[PDB]
Design a binder for this molecule. Structure first.
Ligand SMILES: CCCCCCCCCCCCCCO[C@@H]1O[C@H](COP(=O)(O)OP(=O)(O)OC[C@H]2O[C@@H](n3cnc4c(N)ncnc43)[C@H](O)[C@@H]2O)[C@@H](O)[C@H]1O
Ligand SMILES: NC(=O)c1cccnc1
Ligand SMILES: [Zn+2]
Lengths: 6, 290
């Protein structure tokens, strides 16, 4: 996956 | 392992300290974020106070408009690079041979200035230390002196060979993480004896999921202003989240406060306080004397 707020 | 045994005699800093001095604890992994660089004056933007939408940090918005980012990096660029007690603490782990890896979300290069080497270090969100020409057939490497001269020049960095944008080697929101993140992660988490989670609320993926990669028997210490990494009650509804508090707690400890005070207090239990006092004082002075 890819850097992202969660 | 997959069996949830309790190797910690109790769920405190003191428990973790004795464990840390047992024959069993030899491989230590730190997970760090912005909380360990706030006392160096680099802000975190998820802090209520002194924090900043996230377009600036997103890759699609960087591509169209790279200028907002660079104008801010200036605002935030620190006068002096002085690593904190929390960092020098990680240096002590290294020197004493306990540090398997430091996995960091920060891009500030302070881990390296405290003396962690490439081998010790996974800059999961990249770093400012080096920059690269974004042009695929160029990829010319530039150092921080150069990148800084551009940033503080208020001139947008352009490659001297092809005139393409030169981007700091940081990972933006939307971008893939570096490949070594995963190669290291697949190996490191097999034989980690302790997970030291410092100055991150663990709300960035995939970084956050590192805690679940730890064997269920590895103790996990959190040093942070607030608890984090507990499973959401609703998303849990759809593994390996933190448990400081339930009756099924066995390996997760929360020390709430400043990372510099926690790392300081942990060092005190370990009989490292002096070393750490000397180290910080000597490295700071050495930096003050540039
Ligand atoms: C080199 C100079 C040039 C200029 C560079 C500047 C611009 C950068 C460009 C974009 C940066 C790159 C984009 C990639 O994003 C990464 O996402 C990571 C998330 O890190 P994380 O730490 O999870 O973020 P945050 O949500 O703020 O949580 C903090 C937690 O620490 C607690 N806490 C607060 N204070 C303390 C304390 N004193 N002690 C202990 N804990 C503390 C908080 O309460 C909370 O629990 C980031 O590192 C980031 O690089
Ligand atoms: N390098 C850092 O400490 C940091 C803090 C907040 C966001 N990005 C980086
Ligand atoms: Zn170029």
């Amino acid at each position: 996956p890819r850097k992202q707020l969660a | 392992g997959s069996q949830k045994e309790r190797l910690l005699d109790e769920l405190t800093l003191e428990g973790v300290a004795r464990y840390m001095q047992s024959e069993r604890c030899r491989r230590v992994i730190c997970l760090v974020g912005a909380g360990i660089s706030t006392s160096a004056g680099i802000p975190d933007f998820r802090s209520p106070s002194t924090g900043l939408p996230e377009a600036i940090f997103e890759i699609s918005y960087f591509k169209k408009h790279p200028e907002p980012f660079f104008a801010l990096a200036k605002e935030l660029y620190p006068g002096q690079f002085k690593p904190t007690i929390c960092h020098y603490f990680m240096r002590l782990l290294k020197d004493k041979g306990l540090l398997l890896r430091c996995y960091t979300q920060n891009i500030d290069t302070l881990e390296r200035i405290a003396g962690l080497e490439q081998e010790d270090l996974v800059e999961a969100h990249g770093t400012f230390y080096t920059s690269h020409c974004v042009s695929a057939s160029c990829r010319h490497e530039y150092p921080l002196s150069w990148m800084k001269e551009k940033i503080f020049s208020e001139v947008t960095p352009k490659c001297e060979d092809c005139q393409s944008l030169v981007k700091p080697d940081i990972v933006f929101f939307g971008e893939s993480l570096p490949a070594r993140f995963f190669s290291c992660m697949q190996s490191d988490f097999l034989k980690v004896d302790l997970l030291l989670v410092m100055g991150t609320s663990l709300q960035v993926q995939p970084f956050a999921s590192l805690i679940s990669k730890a064997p269920l028997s590895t103790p996990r210490l959190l040093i942070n202003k607030e608890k984090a990494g507990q499973s959401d009650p609703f998303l849990g509804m759809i593994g390996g989240g933190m448990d400081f508090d339930s009756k099924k707690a066995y390996r997760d400890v929360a020390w709430l406060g400043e990372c510099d005070q926690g790392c300081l207090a942990l060092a005190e239990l370990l009989g490292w306080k002096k070393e750490l006092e000397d180290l910080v004082r000597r490295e700071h002075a050495s930096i003050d004397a540039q």
